[PDB]
Design a protein around this ligand. Structure first.
Ligand SMILES: [Zn+2]
Ligand SMILES: [Zn+2]
Lengths: 96, 217, 126, 107, 57, 215, 97
């Protein structure tokens, strides 16, 4: 009776995984980060399966990219060649 | 006057004293209490299961001990009354062990592909005057596609009692004596073979001494 | 004769019934043994069904206070190079040493869990 | 079977009669003696050698009838009975056992 | 099956199984009842079960 | 020997074949029973009707059921069962009522031994669902002894023929429960509009109470 | 006498915690070509490739160390009602002793 199991919330519960920008403030003026999430050759916005972001963050990246491209902060058809040097965070592989 | 050698075990509760053959420690060190995951559960093994530890299921060893006592008592009474017990498994890992256990005792083993109509179309498959087994023991109730066994269903068809080791992913629905325990590990399977072989043998010599006493009086 | 209807009842019910009716002349070998020692549940056929709405399994999850403090141990001090055995009974691991000595500090009597952790950690170092 | 037994007795008396019949009252009349004898006595002339006359012992004439596999208690003799392929599966089990204990030791 | 929760309320023996036969002095019966609250449960069941019998007799 | 076999349906059933075309295959359904409770139905299919009959009757005697009877003349209670699209309403009836039932049910219950019930079928009158629903209901009857063992109380009968004399039929085999049954005023039971129509007398039919032959 | 719950709490497999990244010792019990069938305790056996370095001291009955990534290896797929069980655990062999 001292040895029967007792009810509690799950120990060893790993904390929930957090996306890369989770807690960070994304702006339409942050064209280094939006350039990270834009494709280097075609200017395409990457999908969820490539970026690895949560739904809210991916939505804000898409809206900020479209805003910056229409306000004149971002090229549409390509990534900034000044920003083809920054840390790559997208799970895509072009070369071979 | 033979109905005494055919009725005295039937009034003596635990006539073969098989209760001294197993304990909860023996089952625990044979790893009987281990089971499959919560996604590999059956609604009809939900009664026999103690709980879930880290999405791994554990069978209640007290229920296992009581059901094993009843199953071994039935098995010993049938071996005393000289029935035929068909040991069935589809392991391919313990097929050698099951068949050698039957040959160490005197009893029969079907560990190969169960052809359709073995127990049901038995008179045409074997011959017109064949005695079907009077008890069928499944040490693994599932086939190799994880489905309940055609001979479980066919023993239910031909009214043969069935003693079966049921795991978490098994169906105890049409088995007369289910023993809720692990049958996926060599220690548990070896302990099951040892207990059943010991029960069949001790039942057979207990019979032998009984009619020896019967013929000397 | 015999009755090959497995879903209407059990072999015991069918056999007792047929020998009461007088169509099975000789009782089978297992019948009187079944009558003497019946199992805990009569084997009647039951169709498995899927739980659909607000129906959950009656299964509980096995958890302990020792599991909580094992969780915080494995959080801070990882699984050491002393490997676990699993083949002998009474195997006392390093995390096991941790849990009983946390418990002896509890039964001696202290209050705040961080203080208990610091005391047991310096005792492990000793 | 009693059929096989009386056929064997009939074949023995018949081959004795056959040797006395042709020329061979000494006891040793071999099978090819029997064949040439029946070939002379009955001119075969059929294109199938099995449609020709044959005079063999009933073991070769009649096929191999398997013995009764259970006594007068039920209880079949071989323990791998209900597989229905008892000799074949016993051979599998035996070869498997020799492979197992050989690994343990090691047209 | 007959429609409704309790089909016995429309079987002509429940209606001629109620017991109240009012005197010739009364003309109007008014039942003010409350749909919610644990205290008006008797009034709710009286409206549900006994008003057809009273009106039938 | 004591088993009697009665056919219930014979149909000429055809299938299409690449070479032959229409290929006639007789499918029959029979019921086998002795008038002591054990009965069973089966289907036999063959190219010859004699072969179909033989297969059907041997398969039924391998597939028998049992039917519990009240005093070996009627069923225990009233049975309502919908098997697929066939609705069967059966009523226990007193002695001497006869077999006022669908003709297949008359034959089957002559094979079983039941003499006094009423049976009305509706929905689709398919023979092969009718017989199986009949057997399902008669095998899933509850008896008075099982009832008394379930509730823990006495089972008594009150006949209008005898009077107010209570006739105990089934007593529990274990302990007797001591709290009385809960008298649920105005019970929640699903009634049948045909039963209520007959009880109140607006069931106007020129077919119901017709003078027919015996059983 | 001790209860089944007593056996459970004073059993090492419950003292494990989560199965992942726990070092275990185990016995080799079956060998085909170079597929070593190791037990580690628990319900099932793991199968490991023969390490090409030191590759002849991996024999029947040898004690080996395992990382033990998983205990059961099941998963559910698109139309299945239950899991598809491998009847096999997952472990990474580290070496000898
Ligand atoms: Zn996020
Ligand atoms: Zn299993």
């Amino acid at each position: 009776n001292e040895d029967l199991p007792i009810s509690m919330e799950n120990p060893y519960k790993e904390p929930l995984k957090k996306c890369i920008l989770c807690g960070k403030h994304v702006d339409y003026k942050n064209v280094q980060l939006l350039s990270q999430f834009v494709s280097p050759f075609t200017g395409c916005i990457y999908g969820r399966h490539i970026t690895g972001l949560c739904g809210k963050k991916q939505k804000e990246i898409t809206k900020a990219i479209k805003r910056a491209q229409i306000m004149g902060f971002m090229p549409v058809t390509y990534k900034d060649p000044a920003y083809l040097k920054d840390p790559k965070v997208c799970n895509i592989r072009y070369r071979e | 006057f033979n109905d005494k050698i055919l009725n005295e075990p039937l009034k003596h509760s635990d006539f073969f004293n098989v209760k001294e053959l197993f304990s909860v420690r023996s089952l625990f060190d044979a790893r009987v209490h281990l089971g499959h995951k919560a996604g590999c559960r059956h609604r009809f093994m939900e009664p026999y299961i103690f709980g879930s530890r880290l999405d791994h299921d554990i069978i209640d060893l007290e229920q296992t001990a009581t059901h094993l006592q009843l199953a071994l008592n039935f098995t010993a009474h049938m071996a005393y009354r000289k029935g035929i017990i068909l040991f069935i498994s589809r392991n391919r890992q313990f097929s050698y062990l099951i068949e050698n256990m039957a040959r160490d005792c005197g009893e029969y083993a079907h560990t190969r592909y169960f052809r359709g109509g073995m127990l049901t179309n038995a008179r045409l498959l074997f011959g017109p005057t064949v005695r079907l087994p009077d008890l069928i023991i499944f040490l693994h109730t599932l086939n190799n596609i994880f489905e309940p066994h055609v001979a479980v269903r066919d023993a239910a068809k031909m009214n043969i009692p069935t003693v079966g080791i049921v795991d978490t992913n098994c169906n105890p629905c049409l088995i007369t004596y289910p023993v809720p325990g692990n049958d996926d590990s060599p220690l548990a399977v070896h302990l099951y073979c040892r207990l059943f072989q010991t029960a069949i043998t001790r039942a057979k010599e207990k019979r032998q001494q009984v009619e020896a006493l019967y013929r000397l009086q | 004769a015999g009755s090959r209807l497995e879903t209407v009842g059990s072999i015991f019910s069918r056999t007792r019934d047929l020998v009461r009716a007088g169509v099975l002349k000789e009782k089978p070998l297992w019948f009187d043994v079944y009558d003497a020692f019946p199992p805990l549940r009569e084997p009647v056929f039951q169709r498995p069904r899927v739980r659909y709405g607000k129906a959950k399994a009656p299964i509980q999850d096995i958890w302990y206070h020792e599991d909580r403090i094992r969780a915080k141990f494995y959080s801070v001090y990882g699984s050491g190079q002393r490997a676990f055995d699993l083949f002998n009974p009474n195997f006392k691991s390093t995390c096991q040493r941790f849990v009983e000595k946390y418990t002896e500090l509890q039964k001696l009597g202290e209050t705040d869990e961080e203080k208990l952790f610091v005391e047991t950690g310096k005792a492990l170092l000793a | 079977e009693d059929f096989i037994k009386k056929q064997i007795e009939e074949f023995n008396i018949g081959k004795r009669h056959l040797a006395n019949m042709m020329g061979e009252d000494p006891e040793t009349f071999t099978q090819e003696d029997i064949d040439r004898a029946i070939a002379y006595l009955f001119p075969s002339g059929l294109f199938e050698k099995r449609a020709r006359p044959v005079m063999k012992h009933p073991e070769q004439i009649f096929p191999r009838q398997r013995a009764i596999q259970w006594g007068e208690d039920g209880r079949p003799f071989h323990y791998l009975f209900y597989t229905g392929k008892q000799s074949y599966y016993s051979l599998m089990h035996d070869v498997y056992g020799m492979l197992l204990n050989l690994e343990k030791h090691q047209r | 099956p007959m429609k409704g929760r309790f089909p016995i309320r429309r079987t002509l023996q429940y209606l001629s199984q109620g017991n109240v036969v009012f005197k010739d002095s009364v003309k109007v019966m008014t039942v003010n009842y409350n749909t919610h609250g644990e205290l008006g449960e008797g009034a709710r069941k009286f409206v549900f079960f006994n008003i057809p019998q009273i009106q039938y007799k | 020997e004591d088993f009697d076999t009665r056919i219930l349906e014979v149909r000429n059933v055809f299938t299409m074949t690449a070479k032959e075309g229409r290929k006639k295959s007789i499918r029959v359904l029979v019921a086998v029973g002795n008038g002591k409770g054990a009965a069973g139905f089966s289907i036999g299919k063959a190219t010859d009707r004699m072969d179909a009959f033989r297969k059907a009757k041997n398969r039924a005697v391998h597939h028998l059921h049992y039917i519990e009877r009240y005093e070996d003349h009627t069923i225990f209670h009233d049975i309502s069962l919908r098997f697929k699209r066939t609705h069967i309403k059966m009523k226990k009836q007193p002695k001497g009522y006869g077999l006022r039932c669908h003709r297949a049910i008359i034959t089957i219950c002559r094979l079983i031994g039941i003499k006094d019930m009423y049976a009305k079928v509706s929905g689709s009158i398919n023979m092969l669902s009718l017989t199986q629903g009949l057997f399902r209901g008669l095998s899933r009857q509850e008896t008075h002894q099982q009832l008394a063992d379930k509730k823990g109380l006495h089972v008594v009968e009150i006949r209008e023929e005898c009077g107010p004399l209570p006739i105990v039929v089934a007593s529990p085999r274990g302990p007797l429960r001591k709290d009385p049954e809960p008298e649920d005023e105005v019970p929640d039971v699903k009634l049948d509009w045909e039963d209520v129509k007959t009880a109140q007398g607006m069931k106007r039919s020129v077919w119901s109470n017709l003078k027919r032959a015996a059983t | 006498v001790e209860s089944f719950a007593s056996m459970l709490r004073h059993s090492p497999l419950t003292q494990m915690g989560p199965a992942k990244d726990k070092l275990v010792i185990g016995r080799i019990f079956h060998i085909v070509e170079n597929d070593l069938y190791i037990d580690f305790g628990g319900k099932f056996h793991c199968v490991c490739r023969r390490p090409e370095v030191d590759g002849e001291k991996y024999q029947k009955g040898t004690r080996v160390r395992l990382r033990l990534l998983d205990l059961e290896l099941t998963s559910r797929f698109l139309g299945a009602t239950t899991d598809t069980t491998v009847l096999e655990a997952n472990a990474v062999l580290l070496g000898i002793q």
